[PDB]
Symmetry: D4
Subunit: 215 residues, 8 copies
């Protein structure tokens, strides 16, 4: 099977949106978009889910040491070789107010992750090549009923409206594939941040078409 690594945040993990903000559970394996993707691709492909809620591109979160994408990705890639493709959808969390990041800052973080994929040939002592990469801008954020979410994401929605533009620019420069998740879904979760069942479905269907086109 052609092997697809899906590297991302809560949107990849499958965070179930709740009115009271948190805590929550995971979408069922056949509902979250990585599951929909695997179903839509069929047996000639394998999907590997590496989504961590609250994950950033490459910036340490001051409240949680687990969240820097770039600290984890190189070890993740070597762990899962042989790979054919890495889909990265990250940057939503970089727009949290407390990071004080501009869209350029966030694209630069994404550029680090693309470079980690591109330079990943061989892993630790193997003959395996580097997989391809697909850079995916998340859909823009939406209004948030929970006061804590409103606070931590102050200015975030505006920044997320820029990610498709800056990611497409970056990907064009680096000569890698790009897809805008916002072109196929809006962020419809009740919390204004996460996905509904339909968002997951529509995104999984769309990415399957991207995956077949690249591989």
């Amino acid at each position: 099977a052609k092997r697809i690594l899906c590297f991302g945040d809560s949107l990849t993990w499958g965070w179930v949106p709740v009115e009271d903000g948190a805590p929550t559970e995971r979408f069922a394996p056949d509902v979250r978009w990585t599951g929909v993707l695997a179903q839509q691709l069929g047996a000639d492909f394998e999907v590997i889910e590496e989504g961590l809620s609250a994950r950033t591109t490459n910036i340490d979160d001051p409240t949680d040491p687990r969240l820097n994408g770039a600290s984890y990705l190189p070890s993740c890639l070597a762990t899962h070789l042989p790979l054919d493709l890495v889909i990265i959808m990250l940057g939503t969390n970089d727009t949290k107010a407390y990071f004080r990041r501009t869209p350029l800052d966030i694209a630069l973080g994404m550029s680090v992750l693309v470079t980690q994929v591109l330079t990943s040939a061989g892993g630790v002592g193997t003959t395996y090549p580097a997989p391809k990469v697909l850079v995916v801008s998340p859909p823009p954020l939406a209004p948030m009923p929970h006061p804590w979410f409103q606070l931590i994401f102050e200015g975030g929605e505006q920044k997320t409206t820029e990610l498709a533009r800056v990611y497409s620019a970056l990907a064009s420069f680096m000569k890698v594939p790009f897809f805008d998740a916002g072109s196929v879904i809006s962020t419809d979760g009740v919390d204004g941040i996460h996905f509904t069942e339909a968002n997951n479905r529509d995104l999984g269907v769309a990415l399957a078409e991207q995956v077949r086109s690249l591989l």
Copy 2:
């Protein structure tokens, strides 16, 4: 399904032993012990493969920034919740000569990893409980025909013969399940480090019993 995370090194990844040391490839999904485990357990269980070649318990490898197990595990646990059990087989690489580690030092690195599992409840914003843990001592190393392997592992065999003892002590003290992989296999790969196909099969069949016993 009940979800089983296999956290390990080349032995968990499935490094095929070769006469010329390196480079190599991965054992087939049905041949590496994580696959044999999955087969044996069946559809009521799901196995998650997080094996990284050259990984240590909790010590930075000066040649490669990817290899500190404790740097990665907390992020990995939160990525894969909900989890029922985490099998950890690590410690072989800690016995490389350049780490200058005693079996006690290695057991202490293992204690960090166990503590990371025991304290992992809720991950990022979830209602999920911590998984159980199973501490696994790898089998003792054997003589190595490749001079480079002989060099980096100088003194290592003697150290690996002590890991069942020190890990059993540790696990008893921490009141967590222990299993000695060396109770069912010896290290039979031609390089004196990695597993034969028959090593992988026997370890998988033994651990399948262990998993069913704990859950």
Copy 3:
């Protein structure tokens, strides 16, 4: 007895306000609010006072290495197990001009301390559970006659008027208890920062009612 840990700053320590700013002494044990609290609760409760003047939520003070709440709290919690409740009233010092912190920054620091309490089960090698937590916003600051206090707290009063809102939001999200000290007292100390005898009394009486409600 049910055991209450009071973790805080000068307001918890019992700093006596003085016209010349500093140096000063501590309020008598039966006057400072932690003492009033203990008297009002009676023998079925025990109060443990961990107030350090100039303490912040989780930010190092450049003039004094002792002042980061989050650096100390985990060791403090393990020291005092068994515990039933931790009252944290901090954030006033985070509003000092030289920290350049917004109310969100300060709530994020408080979130770190709440997480330390929530994850504190077992301490070092015990069977003891985690205590509950009560997040307490301090009352807003007031005008300050001393020129040095005016300087270091420039912009501070405005920020302290926001802490009840941001702390309540945070606490709601994290599903922990919240109480606004500003709902029962104003900052009446002659220095514009610290408490009078009556402030201490009124706060101690109020928190006793909170403590009985939670335990």
Copy 4:
């Protein structure tokens, strides 16, 4: 009242020795030696319990970030002013095999803690004087039936037999009071590390005399 701070490790916390190593509970408030001290001294004195299990003098424990005594003490001193005396019994944990410390290294860690007490006058913005200090060598360790304790403390007993000598030397040189806990008790707990009830009582009655003698 005259205020006595007891800064220590599990021996000061009141770890109940158990056959199975861990986990355990705290000796009752009237049974641990800090409580016996308080009883014996009476209402003219107040004892403050700052004992943290596994605490070292001034060395980071690689398994636990909470345990460096010197990281905590200056903050602790400033928290509890006004203080009349600080009793410090530490050094047992420094003799764990993985710290690779000599009795001299441990005495030097103790010298840091003494220096922190001697230089503590005024704390944060107060008129209060520095307390006196009493350097206490713990009693020598004994044979340990639990294999994990035997491992982590390998070589430790021999080191603890030297602490009265090196701490006496240190204290004489620094011109501060010294007391050897080993002059009145042996380590009689079933685990070979911690105290029996009779150990706690005798140590409390001896230190009560020491406290009255110094103040």
Copy 5:
């Protein structure tokens, strides 16, 4: 003799102002203000000159590792015990544009140095007391003909006009002596930064009167 340590920057070292900015030489020993001070005080006093050009209160200069006052002062004080008084005139260099420091930031740096003096009793193994301290605000900067000086000191003159106010506030709070050098001289050096012969004379005469008043 009563021993006076003069801790400062180029203004204390005795930098000779030159039209071409730099390089330059030192004022003669009987012309620079520390020399004038020693002459005016007479044999009952001794002056010790510790002025380093480009020195800041407590901030590392990115172009020169030698320049952080607070990194050096504690070692300096212990070196020169017994001392009676420490005169600190610093803060001019903190106003360089590239430090992005406000007058409050600079007073906070000065507060660190005052604390180092106040806590300096005993040095390394001595019976000697702490000296007194005199906080001295430098005179305001003036127009600068050299384009490089204009650049590095952009915004500096305005900041230096605030130092007398913030230093006096600080000194009042900390209950230490303060003197404003700007009350007796203007910065008349041709470069707009350093002192003429007359500036040095007038300052030395003034400080002699301060020294006799304190000692």
Copy 6:
């Protein structure tokens, strides 16, 4: 031969401008300006090319650890002794938006590199003197068709228009030679950043005249 070290960025390396931004190749050895310089100088001189694309004066690039000029230059100078002259043309990359550097910041970085040259006498165990230095401001940037270049260089063109002024000021202060590359060429590369063949020629011819004048 008199030996000239050319230390710089892509402009020194000889990056070929391309419409699609990147990747690209190097200008031929006799086309890039360091080659033109060597041809124009003749056999009495030797040119040593140390140009690294994306290099800054003295600031780490968050996407690439190779790029800090000042981290490399001291080792470079000792490597190439005996030297007669070091030409440094750097600062263009410092104007990338993500560095948030002002022209002063960039001149300060250049000042570090000049100091490294001036203090380089002897290298490692030699009798060789320090070479001279020539500070060279790059020509201003131009409009950039590629969206990624537009993004990373936002505000860059304006900053690069200031470098001749700030570098000349710096060089005047430090009493070293200065030349403005912008006085002889405009940035004509199709990407708005790099040089055409004619730019390289005109710059090489100009610098040859500078080199003969200094040596």
Copy 7:
């Protein structure tokens, strides 16, 4: 031309051995082995001299921040692309007594440098492939008449006699070309460390054959 980078220490720089230890000068361009290499290879090749005296494989020298080979090499590789071959002769300096390194430690430092060459494709934004690598063990050290050299290299000769073995093992394992400089020369310089003119010539003539053989 095919481009050959010679990455090394004093032996590559061309340190002239002197009776009095230091200071010294560089062997003439036609006399050092890098020059003899260039002569022998002719105009179809170009040799690039990157030898730094006292350089180690990958360990910071506490007396000199310039000397960590691995700190510099990645920047150096990207500077000099396009490259066909990188010759690395390092490891002599790692055998200095104060580094406390074994031959294995040194081989591991060499493995870092090899890995930096193998992973260097594209440098900064180029289409260029990675060069090949040639691992070269230096010749064993000899007795040293200067007492300072005798001191710093105590135990070093014995270590250098092992480098051909461990580097051959390493290179075989990594599947990269190896050459032992000790197979063609002994260390004949009067200081027991550096090369005679005849040493330089023979090494150059041998490596010329090696270069032609690999390209």
Copy 8:
């Protein structure tokens, strides 16, 4: 006058040896050897006293952040320009048991200090040349009656007997003046570490000749 900087430890400060170890006082200005030096040299010279008790060559003391000689010296040199000669007597404290240093390690720390003097020309913005340096080995330690001194200096006497040899070697190699204090005095203070009055006098009279000889 010609300016002589005396950079040292307690031996340069003038620690009065006492039976009870510590605390103590400073030898009178006319009795410490720096004073005897000044007397003997007369008014054509000026001596500058920079002796700090417990100072090491270049190693942080874990009990005291003030004691790394190399951290302070560059700042000290730039403070006291113009300088003609720097006398450095250090290395005794490096032989304390807890530093685990060999005579070679200590000589290397001394080499850092020498290098700091040799490279000190111009200080901050001056036209002044570097001073000369005189490397001085302290006299060997003697038996110590105080148990704390015996402990911290265990193995130290044997090390100090080697410093004249290793420092002579170092100085010869670096081509700088050397003098052995042990050629004229033995360590005769009652504590086995510090100097008698007659020790101070003889060292001063010998160094006075050395100073006149070098200038």
